[PDB]
Amino acid sequence: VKELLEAGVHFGHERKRWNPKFARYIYAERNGIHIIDLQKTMEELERTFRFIEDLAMRGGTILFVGTKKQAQDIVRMEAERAGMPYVNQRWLGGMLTNFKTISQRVHRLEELEALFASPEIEERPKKEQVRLKHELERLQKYLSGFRLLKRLPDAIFVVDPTKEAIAVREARKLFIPVIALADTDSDPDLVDYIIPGNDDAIRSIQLILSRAVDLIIQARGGVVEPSPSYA
Amino acid sequence: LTDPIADMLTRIRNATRVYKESTDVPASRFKEEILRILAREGFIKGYERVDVDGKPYLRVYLKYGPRRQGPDPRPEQVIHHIRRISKPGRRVYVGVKEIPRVRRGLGIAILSTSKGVLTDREARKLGVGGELICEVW
Amino acid sequence: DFEEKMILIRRTARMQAGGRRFRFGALVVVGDRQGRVGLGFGKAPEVPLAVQKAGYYARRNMVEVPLQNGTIPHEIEVEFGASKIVLKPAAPGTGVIAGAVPRAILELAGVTDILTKELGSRNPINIAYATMEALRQLRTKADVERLR
Amino acid sequence: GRYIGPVCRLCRREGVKLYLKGERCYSPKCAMERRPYPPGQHGQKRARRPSDYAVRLREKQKLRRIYGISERQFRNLFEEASKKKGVTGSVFLGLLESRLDNVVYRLGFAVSRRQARQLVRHGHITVNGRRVDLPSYRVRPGDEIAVAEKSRNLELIRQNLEAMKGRKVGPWLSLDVEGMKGKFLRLPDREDLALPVNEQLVIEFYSR
RNA sequence: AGCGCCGGCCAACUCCGUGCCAGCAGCCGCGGUAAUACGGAGGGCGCGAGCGUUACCCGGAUUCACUGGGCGUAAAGGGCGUGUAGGCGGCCUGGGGCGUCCCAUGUGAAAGACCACGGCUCAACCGUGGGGGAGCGUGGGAUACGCUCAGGCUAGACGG
RNA sequence: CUGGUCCACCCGUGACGCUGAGGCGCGAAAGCGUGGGGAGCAAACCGGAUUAGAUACCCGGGUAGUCCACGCCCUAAACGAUGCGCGCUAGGUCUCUGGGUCUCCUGGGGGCCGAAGCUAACGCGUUAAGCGCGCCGCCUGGGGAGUACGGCCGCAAGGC
Numbered sequence A: 001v002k003e004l005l006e007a008g009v010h011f012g013h014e015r016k017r018w019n020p021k022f023a024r025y026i027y028a029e030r031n032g033i034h035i036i037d038l039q040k041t042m043e044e045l046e047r048t049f050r051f052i053e054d055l056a057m058r059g060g061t062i063l064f065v066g067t068k069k070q071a072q073d074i075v076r077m078e079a080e081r082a083g084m085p086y087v088n089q090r091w092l093g094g095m096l097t098n099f100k101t102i103s104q105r106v107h108r109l110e111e112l113e114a115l116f117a118s119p120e121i122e123e124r125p126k127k128e129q130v131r132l133k134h135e136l137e138r139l140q141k142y143l144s145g146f147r148l149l150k151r152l153p154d155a156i157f158v159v160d161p162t163k164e165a166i167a168v169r170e171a172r173k174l175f176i177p178v179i180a181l182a183d184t185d186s187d188p189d190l191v192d193y194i195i196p197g198n199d200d201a202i203r204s205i206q207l208i209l210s211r212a213v214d215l216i217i218q219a220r221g222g223v224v225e226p227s228p229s230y231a
Numbered sequence B: 001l002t003d004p005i006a007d008m009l010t011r012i013r014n015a016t017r018v019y020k021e022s023t024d025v026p027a028s029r030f031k032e033e034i035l036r037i038l039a040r041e042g043f044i045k046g047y048e049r050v051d052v053d054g055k056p057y058l059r060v061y062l063k064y065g066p067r068r069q070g071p072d073p074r075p076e077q078v079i080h081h082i083r084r085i086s087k088p089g090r091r092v093y094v095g096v097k098e099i100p101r102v103r104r105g106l107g108i109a110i111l112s113t114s115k116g117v118l119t120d121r122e123a124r125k126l127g128v129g130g131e132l133i134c135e136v137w
Numbered sequence C: 001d002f003e004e005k006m007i008l009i010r011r012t013a014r015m016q017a018g019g020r021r022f023r024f025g026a027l028v029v030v031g032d033r034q035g036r037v038g039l040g041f042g043k044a045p046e047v048p049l050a051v052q053k054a055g056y057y058a059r060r061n062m063v064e065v066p067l068q069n070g071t072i073p074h075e076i077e078v079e080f081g082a083s084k085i086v087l088k089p090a091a092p093g094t095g096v097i098a099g100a101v102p103r104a105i106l107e108l109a110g111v112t113d114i115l116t117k118e119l120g121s122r123n124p125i126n127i128a129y130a131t132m133e134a135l136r137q138l139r140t141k142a143d144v145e146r147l148r
Numbered sequence D: 001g002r003y004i005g006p007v008c009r010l011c012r013r014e015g016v017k018l019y020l021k022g023e024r025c026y027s028p029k030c031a032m033e034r035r036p037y038p039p040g041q042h043g044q045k046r047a048r049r050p051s052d053y054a055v056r057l058r059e060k061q062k063l064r065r066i067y068g069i070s071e072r073q074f075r076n077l078f079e080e081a082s083k084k085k086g087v088t089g090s091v092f093l094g095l096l097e098s099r100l101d102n103v104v105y106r107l108g109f110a111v112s113r114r115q116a117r118q119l120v121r122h123g124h125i126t127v128n129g130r131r132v133d134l135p136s137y138r139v140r141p142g143d144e145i146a147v148a149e150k151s152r153n154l155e156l157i158r159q160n161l162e163a164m165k166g167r168k169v170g171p172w173l174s175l176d177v178e179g180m181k182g183k184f185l186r187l188p189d190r191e192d193l194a195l196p197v198n199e200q201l202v203i204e205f206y207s208r
Numbered sequence E: 001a002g003c004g005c006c007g008g009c010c011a012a013c014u015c016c017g018u019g020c021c022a023g024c025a026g027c028c029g030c031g032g033u034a035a036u037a038c039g040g041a042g043g044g045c046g047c048g049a050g051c052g053u054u055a056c057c058c059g060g061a062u063u064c065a066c067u068g069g070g071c072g073u074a075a076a077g078g079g080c081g082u083g084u085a086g087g088c089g090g091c092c093u094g095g096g097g098c099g100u101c102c103c104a105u106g107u108g109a110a111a112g113a114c115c116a117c118g119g120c121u122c123a124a125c126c127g128u129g130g131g132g133g134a135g136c137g138u139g140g141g142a143u144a145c146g147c148u149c150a151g152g153c154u155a156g157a158c159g160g
Numbered sequence F: 001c002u003g004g005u006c007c008a009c010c011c012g013u014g015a016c017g018c019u020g021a022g023g024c025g026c027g028a029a030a031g032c033g034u035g036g037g038g039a040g041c042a043a044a045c046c047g048g049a050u051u052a053g054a055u056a057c058c059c060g061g062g063u064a065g066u067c068c069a070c071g072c073c074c075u076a077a078a079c080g081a082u083g084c085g086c087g088c089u090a091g092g093u094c095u096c097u098g099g100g101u102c103u104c105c106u107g108g109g110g111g112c113c114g115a116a117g118c119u120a121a122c123g124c125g126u127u128a129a130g131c132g133c134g135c136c137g138c139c140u141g142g143g144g145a146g147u148a149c150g151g152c153c154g155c156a157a158g159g160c
Ligand code: SF4
Pocket: D007, D008, D011, D012, D016, D017, D018, D019, D020, D021, D022, D024, D025, D026, D029, D030, D031, D032, D033
């Protein structure tokens, strides 16, 4: 499902603002910008997906983590397309480690889904209506991709391990594997199944997530044609 | 430099804490004999006579444990512990009958003897004592 | 389920206007006397709540210790900041010769024959943690041969 | 010498029946079977958690109060077992058992060790022929423990032998009834007796 | 049959009396009218022809740290250089064999100790036997490391 | 007139090295001796205020001294409260000064943030308080006390 034209979509970026552990994956520093070996990238792409592919044909959950602007919407695209939980906005502290209490809040979301599904007592105070309707807007913003999650994932997928070090930590504490796209600023050893590539160009975010989500449904029954993506 | 031997052991110990694939020590026909024992007893993947800027060195290829689970994915060491026993400040000599069992058997005491560099096991085998070089486990 | 033993129960206080306000802490070790032990330190506004909580952490933090006829495989020494614990292999007839804190751990660990000694600071909390990290570092003839 | 006092207060403190009387022990007029709580003004008050030390004091006092023996001789044996090869617990228990007054009570010659002592003490017992009046004699394998014939024709021995027809006596002991004479076969394995004592804790008492 | 103890360490709890008094006390600390902490009593704990105290030794004290500690702010880097003695010292190859290691051998009295058995009715005590070691004298052996002498090298050091 | 030091070249010497009990020198300020000098400043001292008092803080004065020469003293928060040398253990950034090809690379210094690791914590972190070897100095509860006695140094103050 892979390719050889990933250099036609990213080949990596970012200057001498690196993590010295990532050295084994970098080829050269070009325009004062570290350039990732793409040959090295594929090697892991093989290894990484091999793990993903085993999880897909076993039918186990995946958690998609990405909150930078570059990977803001492009997760909601690919995650729903895989039908698996994601996080688009603020990654709440303790979603995994304190799952029981975090998930205790989704039952309020499902509770608001209940009441505002019409009608049950619209004779409730005008201020009361306003609050809850406002409260629904709030919960939806953060918990939209997290309600799909009803148990602790068999793995989590991350856009920026540096940016989402909090998540990685929780998974580390819970023996939950970490698959991730990661450029030169990230800690390679902290990631289990690593995708050493650009995490800012919306190109590479697409290729890596899509071809992952393509691999997701492919071993789950059927194949499909390319997904929606703004150039 | 005042203790060539210790420097080596320290070069190794330091290099293993950051999991270097290899590391270089200034060469010596005695450092080699020690390194030989270190490789055979399975502490290191091995060594080879290299050159650095025309100068003789010994490159030592380091051996570690498997990738680990949890918050610290750092593998275990193969050399958890290595340190000088005898020193320039104080030469430590033991007869055969007083050769210590390193870690109840799980480790070795490298020793320099009048019949070559031997381990504690081998010393009792060959039946000789000598200067206690170091202990490793 | 496992067997539980309280090691330490202490009161601590903090300050606010109008007086000092308290909290209780509970060192709790837990084990099956078959080579599996756990240590937890539980803190809560009351005594029994804290002990309960300790037991919860105690199971949340385990370590599989390799007994061999009721004794550890090799000698082990670990320092935890200021506190130091010494563990030494002992014959069948020996019994456990240990301070109360590492004794509580090694009895629930099923260790029946071991020589020990505390050194440095004997802070129970720190001594406790120190002993676990020592057990956590015990290796077998296999484990040693396996690595190499 | 030995404890020589009120003996039911012992059991009530130990929380266990120590069969120190013989007959009365089995009757429902036993101290434990009527009051299973400690002797004295505060025996019914709810006990507080016994200290680590408290636990080991009791178990040693228990094992010692069983044999009606002085703390010195107790200590000295333990020490002798502490020096001697093997599992210290076994050797200690065996050595405590190899005492003449105990062997006499074990082979059923008496109802209580307390009574078993006076039998030894008053010359009523013999070993391999010769008379022995020493409650401390170290019984070895091969020792023929007999009643002196000049003491054979006595009520108290008869009544107590009249109970020893079919009562089985440990794997390390033999017995010839009627003839009033038995033999010490071997040193009791820990298995051979199921004394209410975790003897590991006794070692730990003395390691302070 | 006695003696000590029963606040925590540390095993053993209640009543009366006193009221910062009388007194206890190894340390923390007790007593100013609700004292398991003083004195008495009952009861309890521990030992037992002994129990307690004082004195001293070692231990706990890894608190003179060889085993086995420390010196930024806890006690602790000399105000700084220069250098005597001393201590320590790079890579290679030889000779010696002092240190070092091995074997043989002599000495290492007896008693004590350790292990086994045996004599006193047991034990204490005592007898017979057994295992030894350090350490030094001696002869033989080894040479990796330390040493020494000899000959080389240039990574330290110094000079152009 | 003169010391230290860094770089480049990689030409010379062949371990000639490191540390250093004593010893020797140097050692801010104040202080002492002899002789100069003396504008400003300013211990002591005088006065004016403040104040309960004000032998102070503030103000008006003001002598030693501060300055020079030569000779003494040898103390300190003489501090990085961190002895010297050496090897090894991610980097990021600011700066000074050299050499290359000058994008930048490579040395030697001066800071900051930080991998690993250390640490009781604070914090240290290639300028280690990391991991190691060598040598010296020093610590061993608070006060008594840097006191006493003795000794050595000093003109004294006083120092060790
Ligand atoms: S009767 Fe025998 S058993 Fe029951 S208490 Fe008195 S002594 Fe113990």
